[PDB]
């Protein structure tokens, strides 16, 4: 089966980090999601 590409937003934090925030299930991803292609 294929692995989908969900809602992967990039947010620039005051910590100076690029986090990802799964707008999928309203999940977060600090580093690159598994579904991140």
């Amino acid at each position: 089966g294929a692995t989908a590409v969900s809602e992967w937003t990039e947010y620039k934090t005051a910590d100076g980090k690029t986090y990802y925030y799964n707008n999928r299930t309203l999940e977060s991803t600090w580093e690159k999601p598994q579904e991140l292609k």
């Binding site: 910590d15 980090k17 986090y19 925030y21």
Partner: peptide
């Protein structure tokens, strides 16, 4: 569009 707060 407002940002979500970051997780710890």
């Amino acid at each position: 569009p407002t940002p979500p707060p970051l997780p710890p």
